[PDB]
Ligand binder design. Structure first.
Ligand SMILES: Nc1ncnc2c1ncn2[C@@H]1O[C@H](COP(=O)(O)OP(=O)(O)O)[C@@H](O)[C@H]1O
Lengths: 580, 97, 99, 109, 88, 111, 98, 100, 83
DNA sequence: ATCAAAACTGTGCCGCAGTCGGCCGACCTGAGGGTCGCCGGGGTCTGCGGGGGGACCCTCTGGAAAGTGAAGGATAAGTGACGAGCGGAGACGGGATGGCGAACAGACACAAACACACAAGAGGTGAATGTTAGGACTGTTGCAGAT
DNA sequence: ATCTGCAACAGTCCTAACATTCACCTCTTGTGTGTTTGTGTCTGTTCGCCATCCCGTCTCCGCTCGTCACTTATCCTTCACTTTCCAGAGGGTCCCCCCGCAGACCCCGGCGACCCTCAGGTCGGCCGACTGCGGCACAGTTTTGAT
C-alpha cells in the first residue's frame, strides 16, 4: 500500500520544476479549465473527447507536470497536440519555443496539419541536404522560431543546434522507439538539458516488456527514477495462478491502476467514433509435412542434439523449408517450379485450398510475413499460379510506397491479394479497402496486432474483417504464439485502465476489471484441419456459402500426386545424414 | 679414461630404415643429418607445446597440447597423418595393458 | 577552359595524403564479411570479437602495404612505372612466401 | 617376488622411438612444469612418422640413382622434391647437400 | 528464379577497386595496372586463410567458440608478422 | 622487521624488479633464477623504454602536439636505424609508413 | 561489486619513465598499450635467449652473465653497448650499495 | 684447319649441368680458412677453430651465396636480360630484408 | 700473403662456379666485388655470434656447435654438423 | 647432311668405410607403492555477439568518355662478356714435433628455494576536472596548367 | 612566360572525449627473517687436437688475345590507364527481440611428481671381416656446328 507514500514523495518533489525552472493532490491541486476551443484553430472543430483531452492537458500544464497522452489509433492525436500548442500560444502567452519530434513517415502530415489548424504559427521542417539546412541553421540561431519539427536522427545529428537553444516545452511522438532506456536517443535526451516539460504520444502502451518503466517511470517524470527504480520488480512480480495473480496481487494491479490514473489519458475508438464495424479474430492450425515431420528431429539430433541460435532457424522450417536452397536441389535440382515441391510446406496446402476460393468470393487480402525469403518464395509461387498481387518490403525507398496505394486501391483493381511484411511500412500504409487478413508467422510483440490489424481496422472500411492466423502441429511457433499472446495479455490491464483513464465512472476497475478477469480466467480454460470447417469460417454470408458449395459441386464430378509429400521416401532420410 | 656418453637417435633411425627398406644402408653423415633433424623437430614441437601451456594458464603438457602443436607446426597432409599416428599410438598404449 | 590536371599529379597528391594520414583503408563491414566467410570455410559455428576483426584488418593492411612497396621496387627495376602481376609474383617469390 | 620388469613404453604403443628418452627430455628440458602421460608416446609417434616418411622418400631416390646407400645428396633430393617437406624444412640447409637440377626455361636456346 | 544466392555478388569483391588503389597509393605506387586488383585479391585471400587457420587452431584447442584478439595476435606471432597494440 | 625499501628503489631503477623476478620465476625459463637477473634485466628494459619514449617525444614535439600517439612511435622506431633493425618484424597498430617516395616517380624539371 | 580481475601491465612504469625523460608530456592510451606490448616482447626475447644459454652450457641457473650474453646477442650495436653499460652499473650499484 | 671455338653460352650450359649434378665445396679450403680467421681476428685475438667449425662456415656461406644467385637470376630475367648485374644483387637483398 | 689477399682469396672462378650452381648463364664484372662484400658482411655477423657464445662459455675454441647455434639464431638452420 | 669433342655408360680392382657379432660396462628406464596439487565440472551473475529484419543519412564507388603518356617492338651501333691457350704458384694430401686448453674428478661454501606475516605499493573507479586534440570558419599562397 | 586556379597550409572559438589526479578501498604481494641443500667454484691431472713447420706435386688461377652476341639507346606506334562527371547504393549508424556463451568464483576426486630398489638397453672401443665405392685406366653412344 505504497500509494500514500509515493503521494507524499510527489508532495515533496513536485516543486522541482516549479522552483528550478492523495494522487489527486498533485494533479488536481489547481482547478482551472477552459472547455471552449481556442480561436485560431481553423479548418473544422474538435470532437467532445478531444476537448476533454485538451482540458486535461491544460490541467497538466497548470499542475506543471509531465503528462502522457496514450489514446487509441484514429482519435486525433496531432490535432490535440496543436490545440495544446495554440492554447499555450494564445492564453498562456509564453508563445514559444515548441520542439516537436515526429517520425519521417509522418512529418509531411504534421507540417500539413500545421497549415489547417494553426496558420499563424511559425514552423520549421528538417530534411536531408545540409546545403539546404545551413540557411535554416543560421535562421534558428537567430531566434525567429516557435514550432520546430525534426525527426529522430537529426536530434543527435543537430546536437549543437539543440544545445545552443533553451526551449520551453517539447512534445515528442511515437513512444515505441522511446521504449528503451539505454537507447542512444534516450541518452542524448537525458544529456539534452531538458527545459521544462515533455510528452510522449503513443497509440500503444506496454508491448512485449515489463510495465511502463522506460518513459512513464523513469524518463517523463524524473522523481520516479529515485522512487520506483527498485519497486519495478516488486510491482511487476504479479504477472502461481489463483493465490498470487488473482487473490492477493489484484490489489497490486489496483495500485498500478491508481498510480497510472493521473499521469495518463486513454480513450477508445468504439466509445466515441465507432466508425469501424467489427473484428473477427479467428485462428486455424496447419500440420507438419515431409521434411517438417518426425524426420526433422533427426536434423536437430545430428546438428545440435549446425546453425547458431536455432530458434531463428526453427522458424524457417515452419514458415517454409529449403530457404537454405541447398536441399531444394536435393528435391528439385532443375530449379523448375512445379506441384508438390513448393507445396511441401504445410501452410501452402492451406494456401492453395483457401486463396482460390476467396478468389471465388472476391475479398481483397492482406498477406503478411516475416523473413522476406518467404516473401520471395511466395512471389515465385504466385507467379507459378499467375494471380494478381503486389509486394512491399524495406527496400521500396518510400516513393513507390507512397505511389503503390493507387495501384492497389484502383476502384476496379484486379489485384486482390497483397503481400506484406509485418514490420514494413512504419504505420504508413494508411489503407482501408482490403477486407481479409491472413498471417503466416507471429511476431514477438502485440504490435503485429496493433499495427497489422489496424491496417484495416482504421477509418474507411465497412466490411467484416476476417482475420486468420497460421500455426502447425507441435512446433516452436506454438510456444511463440502462446508465450507472446497469453503472457503478453498484460496490455489487457492497460486497455481496462483506459476506461477509467477517461471521464472515470469509478466502478470500472472493480466491475469491468472483473469482466476483464473473465478473460483472465478463461486463459487456461481454453487449454484442453477440415475443408468444410475452414471453408465456413472464412466465409461471411449465404451467397458466399453458395459459391463455396458451387465450387464443391464443380469438383464433385471430378476427383478434387497426393495432398502432402512425406518423408520421396529415401531422399528424406538421405538429406541431412551426410551433412553433419 | 672412459669417455662421457654421447646419446642420440642413431639406432632408432637405423631401425626405421630397416623397416621401410630392408636392403638399403645409411651413411654416417646422413645418420648425423637425421639425428639433427629429429632434435630440431623435437625442439619445435615441445616449444609450441610449452607456448600453449603458458597461454592457456595451465601447467601440464598433455596429448591435447602435443596434438595442437602438431596441427600448427606440420602442414597439410603430413599434419593429418601425424595426428592419425598419434591417436593410434595413444589408444593402443592406454588400451593394451 | 576546364582545369584538368596532366595525368600523374592526382596520383602524387594521393600518395602524399595517404602516407600522411593513418586510418584503415578498407571498409570495415566488407572486410568483416570476408573474414567471417574464410572462417566459415574451417569451422562452421564460430564467433569473433570486434578487436579480433580489427586485429586482422591491421595485419592485412600493413602486409599489403609492405607488399606494394616491394612491388614498386621490382617495377622500377624493370624500367617501368606501372606495376604488374609479374612484379607481384616476383616480390612474393624473392621474399619467399610462395616458393 | 621381484615383479617381472619388462615391457618398455615403446613396446606397448608399437613405436620404435624411445619413449623413455623422449619423456626424460620433455621433463628436464624445462618446457612446462609437469609433463603428462600420453605426451611422449604421442610425440615419439609423430617423430617416427616423420623419419619414416623421409627415409621412404630417400630410399625411393637411391633406387633412382642406382645406389644401395642413402647419402646427403639423396636426403636433399627427397626433401626438396616433396612439396610439403620442402615447405616444412624451407629454412634448413643440409650440409654436403647440393641443389636441385633446375634450369630456367628462358635461358636455353 | 530471383530467389537464389547465386544471383548475388560474392564476398571477395567487397574489397573494392579504389580500396586496393588506396593501399597502393600508401605503398608509394604511382601508376597501377588493371590486373593488380585481381592478383591482390588472390594474395589477400591466401594471407587471411593462413592467419585465420592458425587462430582457429588456437581457439579449438582452448575449448571455446570465440576467436579473440589474443588468438589472432598469437597466430600472427608465430606467422612472423608480429603485431603490437592489441594485447600483451 | 624494519622499514623495507623495494628492490627497485635499492637498485636505483623504475621498473619493478620484484615483478620481473616473479615473471622469470613462473615462466619456466630455468630452474634457478639468480639474484642479479631481475635487476640486470629491469635495467635493460628501462634503457629501451627510455630510448623509445625519447625519440617519440621528439617527433611528438615536431608535429606540434603534446601527446604521444602510435604514428609518433612509428616515426621514431623507423627513423632510428638500430630500432629499425631490432623491431624490423613488428607491425605497430594505427602506424602508417614513413613518408617516402622514389625519385623515379617524381616528375622531371623539363616541361 | 564483481572486482574486475587484475591484469598487471607496465603502464605506470612507462608513464613514470616518460615523466623522467620529458617533464610535461602525456601519452595516449593506445600508445601506452603499444609500449606495454613492447616491454613484454623484449622481456620474452631476452628471457628466452637466457633459457637457451642455460641449456647450452649444461647449467641450470639464469644469472647476470646469462642476461648479459642475451643482451649482446639480441641488441644491435650502440643499443647493446649502452644496455650492457646500464646493466653493469645497476647491478654493481644494487650489490655494493646494499 | 680451324680449331673448334664453341659458340659462347654452351660452355655455360654444360657448367650449369655439371655443378647441379655434383655436390662438393667450391671455395677452396685454405683461402676460406684464412678469411674466417681474419674476420674472427676482428673480435678476439687468441681464438682457435675446429675443422668442423670452419667447414660449417663454408657449408653455410656457400649455401647462402647459391640461394642469392638463384634470386639474382630471377631478378635479371625479370628485367628482360640474361647478364646479372650489381643492381640485381642489391635488389634481392632489398626485397629479402637484409639491406633496407 | 700478408693479409692483403684474404677476401681476394675468394677467387673469380670460384665466384663463377657458385654462380653456375645458381643457374646464372652470364656474369658482369662487378658481381665479383659485390659478392665479396656480401660474403664478408654475412661472415662478420655469424662469427660475431659464435665468438659471443665462445666468450660466454669461458673458453678459447670456436667449435661446430657454437657455429650451429649462431646460425640457428640467425634464421639459417644447419643440419649435419652436430645434434 | 657428315666429321668432332666430349660426357654418359660399361669394365676392372682396390681403399675404405659401414656393419655386425661381440664382449662387456655402466647407468638409467621400469614398476609397485605413497601423497598431494590440478583440473574438470556443475552452478549463478553479467555483458556482448549472433540472426532474421526494419528506417534513415550521406560519401564512396561505379560506368563511361576524351585524352595522352607509358609499354613495347624493330633496328642498329657499341662493347664488354666468354672461350682457349699457356706458363707459374699456391693449394693439397702426407707426415711429423710440440704444447695447450678442454674435459673429467672432488670439497666445499655461499646462494637460492621454501615457508611465513604484512603493509605498503599497485589496480580499479568515479569524478570532477580540466584540457588538449578534431571540427569546422576565414584567410593566405605554393604549385600546376590553359593561353 | 603573367595570369588564373585551386588546394594544401595556417589562425581561431568550440565542444567534447579523454587523460589526470586524488582518494581510498581493498587487497594482493613483494619484502624481511630463518633453515636447507645443492649447484657452482677452484684446483688439479692428462691427452686429443690444433697450430706450425716442411714438402713434393700438379692442376688450376691469371693473364692475354680474339670475336660476337648481348646490353642499350633511338623512334614509332598503339592502347590502356587516368581524370572528370553524374547517379545510385551500400556502408554507417541506430533499433528490434531473444538467446546463448565466455568469464569469473567453489568443493572435489585424478593423477603425476616422488623416492627407492632392479635389470637390461644402449654405448663404446677394439677386433673381424665384409662389401660399396671410387680412381686412374680403357672402349662405344649422342649432341654441336659448319659445307
Ligand atoms: N476534430 C477533428 N476534426 C476533423 N478531423 C479530425 C479531427 N480529429 C482528427 N481528425 C482526423 O484525424 C487524422 C489524424 O489523426 P491523428 O492525430 O493521427 O490520430 P491517430 O494517431 O489516433 O490516428 C487527420 O487526418 C484528421 O483529418
Amino acid at each position: 500500500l505504497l500509494d500514500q507514500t509515493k503521494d507524499t514523495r510527489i508532495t515533496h518533489l513536485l516543486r522541482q520544476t516549479n522552483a528550478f525552472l492523495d494522487y489527486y493532490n498533485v494533479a488536481h491541486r489547481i482547478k482551472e479549465d477552459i472547455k471552449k476551443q481556442p480561436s485560431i484553430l481553423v479548418g473544422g472543430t474538435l470532437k467532445d473527447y478531444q476537448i476533454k483531452g485538451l482540458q486535461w492537458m491544460v490541467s497538466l500544464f497548470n499542475n506543471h507536470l509531465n503528462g502522457i497522452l496514450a489514446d487509441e489509433m484514429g482519435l486525433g492525436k496531432t490535432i490535440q497536440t496543436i490545440s495544446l500548442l495554440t492554447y499555450l500560444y494564445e492564453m498562456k502567452n509564453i508563445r514559444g519555443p515548441y520542439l516537436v519530434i515526429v517520425p519521417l513517415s509522418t512529418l509531411s502530415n504534421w507540417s500539413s496539419e500545421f497549415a489547417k489548424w494553426a496558420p499563424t504559427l511559425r514552423t520549421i521542417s528538417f530534411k536531408g541536404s545540409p546545403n539546404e539546412r545551413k540557411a535554416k541553421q543560421a535562421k534558428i540561431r537567430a531566434g525567429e522560431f516557435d514550432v520546430v519539427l525534426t525527426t529522430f536522427e537529426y536530434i543527435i545529428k543537430e546536437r549543437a543546434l539543440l544545445s545552443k537553444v533553451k526551449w520551453v516545452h517539447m512534445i515528442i511522438d511515437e513512444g515505441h522507439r522511446m521504449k528503451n532506456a539505454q537507447s542512444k536517443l534516450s541518452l542524448t535526451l537525458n544529456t539534452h538539458y531538458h527545459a521544462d516539460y515533455r510528452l510522449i504520444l503513443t497509440g500503444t502502451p506496454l508491448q512485449n516488456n515489463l510495465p511502463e518503466l522506460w518513459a512513464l517511470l523513469n524518463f517523463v517524470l524524473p522523481k520516479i527514477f529515485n522512487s520506483v527504480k527498485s519497486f519495478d520488480e516488486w510491482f511487476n512480480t504479479p504477472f502461481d495462478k489463483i493465490e498470487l495473480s488473482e487473490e492477493e496481487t489484484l490489489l497490486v494491479i489496483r495500485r498500478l491502476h491508481k498510480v497510472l490514473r493521473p499521469f495518463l489519458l486513454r480513450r477508445l475508438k468504439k466509445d466515441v467514433e465507432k466508425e469501424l464495424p467489427d473484428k473477427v479474430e479467428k485462428v486455424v492450425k496447419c500440420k507438419m509435412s515431409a521434411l517438417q515431420q518426425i524426420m526433422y528431429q533427426q536434423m536437430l539430433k545430428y546438428r545440435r542434439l549446425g546453425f547458431n541460435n536455432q530458434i531463428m532457424q526453427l522458424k524457417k522450417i515452419c514458415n517454409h523449408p529449403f530457404v537454405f536452397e541447398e536441399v531444394e536441389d536435393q528435391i528439385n535440382p532443375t530449379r523448375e517450379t512445379n506441384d508438390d515441391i513448393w507445396r511441401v510446406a504445410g501452410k501452402f496446402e492451406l494456401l492453395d485450398r483457401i486463396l482460390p476460393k476467396l478468389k471465388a468470393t472476391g475479398h481483397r487480402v492482406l498477406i503478411f510475413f516475416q523473413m522476406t525469403q518467404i516473401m520471395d518464395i511466395m512471389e515465385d509461387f504466385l507467379r507459378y499460379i499467375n494471380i494478381k498481387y503486389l509486394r512491399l518490403d524495406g527496400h521500396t525507398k518510400s516513393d513507390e510506397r507512397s505511389e503503390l496505394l493507387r495501384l492497389f486501391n484502383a476502384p476496379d483493381s484486379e489485384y486482390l491479394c497483397f503481400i506484406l511484411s509485418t514490420r514494413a511500412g512504419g504505420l504508413g500504409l494508411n489503407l482501408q479497402t482490403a477486407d481479409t487478413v491472413i498471417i503466416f508467422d507471429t511476431d514477438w510483440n502485440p504490435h503485429q496486432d496493433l499495427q497489422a490489424q489496424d491496417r484495416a481496422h482504421r477509418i474507411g472500411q465497412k466490411n467484416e474483417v476476417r482475420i486468420l492466423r497460421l500455426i502447425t502441429t507441435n512446433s516452436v511457433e506454438e510456444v511463440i504464439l502462446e508465450r507472446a499472446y497469453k503472457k503478453l495479455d498484460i496490455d489487457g490491464k492497460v486497455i481496462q485502465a483506459g476506461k477509467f483513464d477517461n471521464k472515470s465512472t469509478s466502478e470500472e476497475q472493480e466491475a469491468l476489471l472483473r469482466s476483464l478477469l473473465d478473460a483472465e480466467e478463461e486463459r487456461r480454460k481454453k487449454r484442453e484441419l477440415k475443408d468444410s470447417e475452414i471453408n465456413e469460417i472464412l466465409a461471411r454470408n449465404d451467397e458466399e456459402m453458395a459459391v463455396l458449395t458451387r465450387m464443391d459441386e464443380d469438383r464433385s464430378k471430378k476427383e478434387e500426386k497426393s495432398r502432402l509429400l512425406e518423408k520421396k521416401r529415401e531422399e528424406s532420410e538421405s538429406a541431412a545424414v551426410y551433412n553433419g | 679414461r672412459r669417455k662421457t656418453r654421447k646419446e642420440s637417435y642413431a639406432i632408432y633411425v637405423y631401425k626405421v630404415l630397416k623397416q621401410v627398406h630392408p636392403d638399403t644402408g645409411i651413411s654416417s653423415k646422413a645418420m648425423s643429418i637425421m639425428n639433427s633433424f629429429v632434435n630440431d623437430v623435437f625442439e619445435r614441437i615441445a616449444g609450441e607445446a610449452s607456448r600453449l601451456a603458458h597461454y592457456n594458464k595451465r601447467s601440464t603438457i598433455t596429448s591435447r597440447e602435443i596434438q595442437t602443436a602438431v596441427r600448427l607446426l606440420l602442414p597439410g597432409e603430413l599434419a593429418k597423418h601425424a595426428v592419425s599416428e598419434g591417436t593410434k599410438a595413444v589408444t593402443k598404449y592406454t588400451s593394451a595393458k | 577552359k576546364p582545369h584538368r590536371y596532366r595525368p600523374g599529379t592526382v596520383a602524387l597528391r594521393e600518395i602524399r595524403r595517404y602516407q600522411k594520414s593513418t586510418e584503415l583503408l578498407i571498409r570495415k563491414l566488407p572486410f568483416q564479411r570476408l573474414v567471417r566467410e574464410i572462417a566459415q570455410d574451417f569451422k562452421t559455428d564460430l564467433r569473433f570479437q570486434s578487436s579480433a576483426v580489427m586485429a586482422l584488418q591491421e595485419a592485412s593492411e600493413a602486409y599489403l602495404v609492405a607488399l606494394f612497396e616491394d612491388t614498386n621496387l621490382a617495377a622500377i627495376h624493370a624500367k617501368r612505372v606501372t606495376i604488374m602481376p609479374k612484379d607481384i609474383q616476383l616480390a612474393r617469390r624473392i621474399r619467399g612466401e610462395r616458393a | 617376488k621381484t615383479r617381472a620388469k619388462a615391457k618398455t613404453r615403446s613396446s606397448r604403443a608399437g613405436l620404435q622411438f624411445p619413449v623413455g628418452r623422449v619423456h626424460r627430455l620433455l621433463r628436464k628440458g624445462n618446457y612446462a612444469e609437469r609433463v603428462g602421460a600420453g605426451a611422449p608416446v604421442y610425440l615419439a609417434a609423430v617423430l617416427e612418422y616423420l623419419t619414416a616418411e623421409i627415409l621412404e622418400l630417400a630410399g625411393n631416390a637411391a633406387r633412382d640413382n642406382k645406389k644401395t646407400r642413402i647419402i646427403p645428396r639423396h636426403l636433399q633430393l627427397a626433401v626438396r622434391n616433396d612439396e610439403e617437406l620442402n615447405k616444412l624444412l624451407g629454412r634448413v640447409t643440409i650440409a654436403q647437400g647440393g641443389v636441385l637440377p633446375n634450369i630456367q626455361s628462358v635461358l636455353l636456346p | 528464379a530471383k530467389r537464389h544466392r547465386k544471383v548475388l555478388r560474392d564476398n571477395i569483391q567487397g574489397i573494392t577497386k579504389p580500396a586496393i588503389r588506396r593501399l597502393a597509393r600508401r605503398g608509394g605506387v604511382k601508376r597501377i595496372s588493371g590486373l593488380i586488383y585481381e592478383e591482390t585479391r588472390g594474395v589477400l585471400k591466401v594471407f587471411l586463410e593462413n592467419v585465420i587457420r592458425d587462430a582457429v587452431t588456437y581457439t579449438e584447442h582452448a575449448k571455446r567458440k570465440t576467436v579473440t584478439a589474443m588468438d589472432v595476435v598469437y597466430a600472427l606471432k608465430r606467422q612472423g608478422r608480429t603485431l603490437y597494440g592489441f594485447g600483451g
